[PDB]
Amino acid sequence: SSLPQSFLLKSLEQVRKIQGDGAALQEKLCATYKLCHPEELVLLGHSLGIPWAPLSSCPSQALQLAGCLSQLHSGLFLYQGLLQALEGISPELGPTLDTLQLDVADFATTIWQQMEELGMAPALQPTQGAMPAFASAFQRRAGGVLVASHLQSFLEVSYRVLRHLG
């Protein structure tokens, strides 16, 4: 209710596309490798050490709409980095990961353009970051399960946030 329809309608459709891409990934990981349960990969997740992206309530404000979207953008950035570090997982899964990355990037672009319009502090000079390490094919594959399930949760919440700011 606070953002232009061009942004609202596009941004929701972009989320749904990424959710569908992500579901495809999840389904292929389960069917190919029998990795079907993120909750069975707790000890692996502990070893990987990944800081999953937070979201948190924001008012439909003049002076913090941009800050609400900035959290979404910062989470998308974290997820894009995780998707990148997977390096396609396997030749079977590569094209599905490529599609998911492209769709994530398209969404992030839309978010960033809206943050500019709303009035955001400029980004600081960038720096290289660190990545998760997958010590094996199995860790890449199980890491893919974890990344995807947390990305799904971040998307479900993002969709709600966008409807709430709409």
UniProtKB/Swiss-Prot annotation:
Domain of life (superkingdom): Eukaryota
GO molecular function, one term: granulocyte colony-stimulating factor receptor binding
Carbohydrate attachment residues: T127
PTM notes: O-glycan consists of Gal-GalNAc disaccharide which can be modified with up to two sialic acid residues (done in recombinantly expressed G-CSF from CHO cells).
Subunit structure: Monomer.
Function per UniProt: Granulocyte/macrophage colony-stimulating factors are cytokines that act in hematopoiesis by controlling the production, differentiation, and function of 2 related white cell populations of the blood, the granulocytes and the monocytes-macrophages. This CSF induces granulocytes.
Record's protein name: Granulocyte colony-stimulating factor
Organism: Homo sapiens (Human)
Part of the intact protein present: 37 to 205 of 207
